[PDB]
């Protein structure tokens, strides 16, 4: 029925810090091709608190494209957890947030329900791979990773996560999954 | 000149039983895209006799496609050997048959000349790979296998069989050979 | 700024002899698709002298294409070094030449500046890989090799040479780099 559910629960938001490189996106006009230019990169601030409200900043940037004439690009997002977070814990049962475009002290609400679908920790308890998506299989979906490239082994595991989460098999193939160019970055 | 000839002769029709998964087809409108949906599968009845007439039933099925809105699909074929078969042998010099669409006790002739071009046996004398085709290089052609996927090693061997059979090199590349989606089946 | 410069200097023109197979070209209408048909092949005469003028003949050929109806094709080029060459040396600091179409004792000037961008020698001091290109990143560019295919390892090294020479990253991906069909030749 296309309803996607979260796979990775009881996530530690303190670990939600550092740089992640976009590996692939789906073809939602909300994020594609705008957020899928070459060398696309996401820096996460890690948890900040505004009382019982938890949130995280994301700095997006990507490189120019000579053959397409596109200049380089950068913008900032804020992810606000929809459920209050206790001031005694940095762990949420599921990561469900609203997303804002931010500039200076201005913010504009983009979407009320962005989820961390899947999250994998390496052997040092740092995030290796993150998948972000909506509540339906045709809403924006992004695969990002700690390194610019992943082995084929790894990529097929990440695609299998989307299947287990409820994405239909015919959506898990091009032109509905598109890989981001990370060469020469 | 595009005339294709059979490579694999003296075939045992008793071994023509079990399930085979479609790996690739050519682009003949007779079979593509109708018989090339995801998870396409062929069950062979193995030899049946109607006097000196030999034949085999094939149950086709494939899975639905959400993004294309296609429902799942299934139909039945009958392959009738064109040459009489002696009641004392299950082996033909070449497998040359007419193909019918079948439903209940009704049948409709589709094509008078379908051949087994290539057939490979594993070390237990079971069929591992089958290629079915016509008498010309632009007539329907199907590659099927005992498993859902084959190694690259193996796939290049099967493509080389089509070259040895008379298929022109420029037909052995996309968009003239198309691979079937066998993931998540 | 798209200006490409030569990487490989102090090249020995005596070694510029033998057969090379085209691996990929860019999409310049000057050479694509004309010089990129299947089984495309280049025979180099090795250095000839006309006084202090050095030059080399190149015989191009490629195979027919049944599905496209194209007949086989062959033609001859002459590469004339633009700088005089001393009669005591077979080595140039850079290989910069004009290119002519040749037939019988007739010649027609095609382009005044064709360069050897990159050249790699194997362990026997023979050319293994050659990249030929212009003075801008959107002028014709051809990758050729001593064998019909190269390992992925090797191909990524050759693409990295074009980046170091000044080709923009967004030009080093399809549809701006196109691979030549070398199967069944
Ligand atoms: C999973 O989803 C998202 N993930 C991210 C990162 C955390 C990886 C950012 C954004 C979305 C998103 C979801 N729904 C919408 S609308 C929108 N805007 C794009 C920026 C714009 O200025 C140009 N098109 C205006 C529209 N972004 N998103
Ligand atoms: C090698 O060839 C074939 N192999 C097979 C299997 C044994 C793998 C089946 C069928 C052909 C075939 C050859 N010539 C035609 S016409 C046709 N029909 C498709 C079913 C239809 O109901 C929808 N298009 C009506 C038309 N099938 N074939
Ligand atoms: C690197 O560049 C080239 N390398 C080669 C080989 C040494 C690999 C040959 C040619 C060029 C080239 C450069 N600028 C032009 S124009 C042209 N002609 C193609 C033949 C034609 O008869 C049909 N289109 C008339 C036009 N070839 N070239
Ligand atoms: Cl940039
Ligand atoms: Cl670029
Ligand atoms: Cl949105
Ligand atoms: Cl990996
Ligand atoms: Cl892609
Ligand atoms: Cl189904
Ligand atoms: Cl599906
Ligand atoms: Cl038919
Ligand atoms: Cl295999
Ligand atoms: Cl394909
Ligand atoms: Cl030929
Ligand atoms: Cl051909
Ligand atoms: Cl030119
Ligand atoms: Cl190699
Ligand atoms: Cl290509």
């Amino acid at each position: 029925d296309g309803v996607v559910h979260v796979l990775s629960k009881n996530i530690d938001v303190k670990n939600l810090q550092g740089t992640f490189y976009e590996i692939a996106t789906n073809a939602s006009d909300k994020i594609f091709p705008g957020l899928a230019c070459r060398c696309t990169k996401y820096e996460f601030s890690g948890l900040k608190r505004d009382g019982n409200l938890g949130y995280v900043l994301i700095n997006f940037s990507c490189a120019r494209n000579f053959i397409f004439g596109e200049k380089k690009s950068e913008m900032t997002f804020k992810l606000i957890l929809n459920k209050p977070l206790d001031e005694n814990t940095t762990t949420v049962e599921e990561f469900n947030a609203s997303i804002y475009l931010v500039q200076g002290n201005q913010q504009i609400l983009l979407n009320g329900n962005i989820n961390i679908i899947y999250a994998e920790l390496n052997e040092q308890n740092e995030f290796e791979h993150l998948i972000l998506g909506g509540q339906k299989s045709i809403e924006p979906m992004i695969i990002m990773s700690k390194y610019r490239t992943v082995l084929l082994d790894t990529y097929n595991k990440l695609i299998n996560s989307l299947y287990l989460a409820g994405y239909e098999p015919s959506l898990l193939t091009w032109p509905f999954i598109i890989q981001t160019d990370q060469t020469f970055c």
Side-chain angles (χ1 to χ4, degrees), chain A:
Chain A
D1 58 338
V3 185
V4 317
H5 58 256
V6 165
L7 297 172
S8 295
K9 309 230 208 233
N10 296 310
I11 273 164
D12 190 349
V13 186
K14 280 229 244 202
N15 297 328
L16 221 178
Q17 204 210 81
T19 296
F20 296 92
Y21 305 101
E22 186 169 277
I23 299 299
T25 69
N26 69 346
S28 175
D29 312 74
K30 285 299 149 200
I31 63 159
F32 182 87
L35 295 179
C37 31
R38 42 180 316 268
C39 312
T40 286
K41 197 174 86 175
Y42 299 104
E43 289 161 82
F44 290 79
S45 75
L47 177 71
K48 315 229 171 111
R49 289 183 120 119
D50 262 16
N52 69 4
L53 272 206
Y55 72 97
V56 152
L57 258 58
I58 307 163
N59 297 297
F60 156 89
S61 61
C62 77
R64 60 193 84 270
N65 190 293
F66 169 94
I67 194 64
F68 273 21
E70 288 163 11
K71 229 264 175 194
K72 78 182 187 222
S73 165
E74 53 272 325
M75 75 215 272
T76 299
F77 298 97
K78 185 194 278 173
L79 272 183
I80 309 195
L81 288 167
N82 288 321
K83 166 155 150 233
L85 183 75
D86 302 340
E87 284 160 17
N88 38 302
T89 176
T90 60
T91 278
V92 301
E93 156 175 336
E94 332 170 33
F95 199 102
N96 174 242
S98 297
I99 194 165
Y100 298 74
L101 184 68
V102 160
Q103 167 183 102
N105 62 2
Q106 308 286 109
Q107 66 191 40
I108 287 184
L109 175 55
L110 295 171
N111 189 285
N113 281 292
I114 294 207
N115 302 316
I116 296 192
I117 302 291
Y118 181 61
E120 165 160 19
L121 285 311
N122 65 34
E123 300 181 348
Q124 286 173 336
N125 311 86
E126 288 163 328
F127 282 124
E128 210 137 43
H129 317 295
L130 292 171
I131 307 180
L132 277 64
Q135 292 175 327
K136 314 303 306 282
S137 62
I138 74 171
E139 283 163 343
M141 188 284 308
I142 289 162
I143 291 153
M144 58 189 75
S145 183
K146 172 169 199 127
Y147 301 99
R148 307 208 90 113
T149 66
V150 296
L151 294 160
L152 186 269
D153 209 346
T154 300
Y155 182 84
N156 287 342
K157 283 157 153 137
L158 293 178
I159 298 302
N160 194 69
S161 300
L162 296 172
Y163 177 64
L164 290 180
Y167 291 84
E168 283 88 337
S170 59
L171 288 173
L172 303 178
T173 281
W174 183 103
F176 304 102
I177 304 274
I178 299 147
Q179 321 249 17
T180 320
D181 193 5
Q182 293 287 353
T183 78
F184 304 113
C185 302

